[PDB]
Amino acid sequence: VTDSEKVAEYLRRATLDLRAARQRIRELESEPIAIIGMACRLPGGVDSPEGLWELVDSGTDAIAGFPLDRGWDVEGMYDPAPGKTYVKEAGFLYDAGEFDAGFFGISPREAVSMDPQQRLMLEASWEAFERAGLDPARQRGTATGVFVGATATGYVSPAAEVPEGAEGFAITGNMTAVTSGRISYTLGLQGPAVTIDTACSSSLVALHLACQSLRQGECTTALAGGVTVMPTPTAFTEFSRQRGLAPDGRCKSFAAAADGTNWAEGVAVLVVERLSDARRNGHRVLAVVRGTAINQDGASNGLSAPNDLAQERVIRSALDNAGLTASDVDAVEAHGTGTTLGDPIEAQALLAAYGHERPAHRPLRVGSLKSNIGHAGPAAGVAGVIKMVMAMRHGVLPRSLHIDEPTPQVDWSAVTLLTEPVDWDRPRRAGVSAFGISGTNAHVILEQAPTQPAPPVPAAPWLLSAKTPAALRAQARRLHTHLARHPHPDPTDIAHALATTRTPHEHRAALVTDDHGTRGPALAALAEGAPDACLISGTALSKGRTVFVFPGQGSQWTGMGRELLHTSPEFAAYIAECETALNDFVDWSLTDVLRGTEGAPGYDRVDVVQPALFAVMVSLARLWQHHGIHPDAVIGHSQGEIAAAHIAGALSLQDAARIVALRSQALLPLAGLGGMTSLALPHDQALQLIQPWGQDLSIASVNGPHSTVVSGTTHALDELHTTCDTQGVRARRIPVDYASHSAQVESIRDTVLQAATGINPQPTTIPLYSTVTGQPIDGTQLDADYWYTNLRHTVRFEETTRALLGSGHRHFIETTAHPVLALALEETIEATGSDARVTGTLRRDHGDLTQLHTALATAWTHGIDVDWTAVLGDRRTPFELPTYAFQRQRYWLEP
């Protein structure tokens, strides 16, 4: 090759690596962070970000009288001088003492001893994770950061000989570091838990630190939040000595009537991560924090004074960090404290920084959340970003209250205030400022999230769960209310969101129906707890090993598996494999028998029903395994054991097909000689009842403590039926013309030995329980003599079920076309006093996808883990479900 073409490839490699390194630099310094979730509790009844949006958009003024349950001497501490205050109303969280101690594992002792800042912050973080489409329980072990802007407002009062009740927990319950630490401890997060003390700027500084941590790869996701609560009214008294609080309590932000600043409570948290990570993981992006900046003023006229130069510098630094021109943003969530000193300085800083070269028809629209709820304090910036996020989402800037006129202290003649709401070529961008009293100015820039199907599975279960039944009812009511205000949501998307993006709690319920006319009433009946046809409820077991159960005959009905053959492709594939295995050892096809094709034999014949039952059971068990329910044990019943022997891995498909087909064919001559009769009695009573007939009859199967099947000759069977009718015993004759598990099979014994010849047994992968021996059996021992004994010796289903329950097994999934042994299994379970729950797959005249999903939902409600991804899908459109319905209780410290 020439030298030129040789060096060309090296140049190409070099420039590609150069581009890769430059892109690495760009994503390592100027990476856009994605706000994937948020959660706020602010005064005025606001509990969700949507509550905040409807509050601020409506122009509601969320300032009301002081709380009366906090022990304050509210009638006495009002004086419009020495140690009193001249304000009688501010933004308060009257439910600040309300907290769900049990949900997070916290004790009432620790809860009352714990700062309400931590109590609010835990719930806010949990809701923020839930609103991001993330399951908080699945966040355990992840490198998730926690950055909280909080402060020691004083709830236990360490300087005052902390009370006897909160003794021992006044460090853990009140250190400001533990406010961030407890989130990670409860949620199991691994990223750093750092709390920031910066007075009225801590939350936005925490967002800055979270952004820097995520950009450096120290975290995968992060919690950037703030909290403010007022255990004592000192913040009003200390700031009343200087005329800093407004006389009426309204934060007249940037208004000519600006005369002070009223404080307020509130918690506000964001769950954020890298934008590329959000796109890769398929999380919904609410907004994009492009850049951030923080600095100081230092040379301010007094320590607690502002500085226009510092505010301009941080604004310009934030703009440069995001790589955005000042004219790019068309809105600012100014601090807007309302002070006479602070407002003109902030307005001058905004005018100098942002509005200097903007077009003559797009002024910068300035507003403040403080006019609505008052000064939140630490949680001010992280609430302002929520306000701007929802303003971008709804495409309208809400009005800022109490602006009778723009303040005359600044020359507006570029920038205009949001006196009334205003509506909105290029992405929407907005700034937020969190200037503090300690001089730490902060500023962030947010941008509109960038613009981002599968067929609907029928009868998609809707899953609900909660820690307690009352919480479950609250969850159902909340979901019903949410679905009422929605124009025709997609039910499969709701099913996916409920199954995947919400924790499975203890008390569970499910709604399985294929029509969008019963789900509403079912949700209601769940809400008031009434029963419903398409509703299932239960208490999931913490631990327990799973069992597959394979009964013998009886679980047959025409058309079984017909609907599943069309609807379910996995079941069709398994039936096809069974048919291919069976073809060589029989003179017809399984699919024709199941589909009821013309001329195919019916289920009356013994030789065709048993292979059909085997194939259906094996296919159903494999479908269960495909849905993620891998058995911990398998048990059978007569011919069903062969199917169990296939699922355990001891017998290949060909060997099991050979055994079942040849065994049934060798059982054909027994037809008409005798039959079975099921009578409900103990084993000893049946045994001593069959004594006069001697060898004619025998105990065919001990299904349960009060359910035994006896097999024998037709004449003796009728004689015993008449005797039971005389004795008033509920004896039922099974529809079978052949007396299996009786002496008659000896007549065909050698032929049975021919049925199992040539097989290749293997050790069991899954522990198989032989109903003949009554305990686990090695897989290699399944020889011809074993199968002959299975056909001949009495089944001991009750004994092996008792032994299996003794081994910690707690779930019994019948893989039949219709439950036949569920009664006996439940009888044994209640006899031994265990908490095991029995389930079935299909039911008579019910074999479509709806019944399959009903069985799966019942199993999940009983506590069996189910891979809902396979049932529903890998990824559907995101759906915003309501957060957890906490059952709160009052927790406050008394003097």
Partner: protein, 49 residues
């Protein structure tokens, strides 16, 4: 002073509430006719279920 009392109006948090069930019987004076509160509360119970 051990036998002095008064009545006050404690503020409380806006409860989450629930959904209106079945039918609710609203009775109104005909002097008001369709004015303010009656129409609005009728609508409120309408969208409340």
């Amino acid at each position: 002073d051990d036998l002095r009392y008064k009545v006050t109006w404690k503020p409380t948090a806006v409860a989450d509430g629930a959904s209106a069930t079945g039918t609710w019987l609203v009775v109104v004076p005909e002097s008001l006719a369709g004015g303010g509160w009656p129409v609005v509360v009728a609508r409120a119970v309408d969208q409340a279920g």
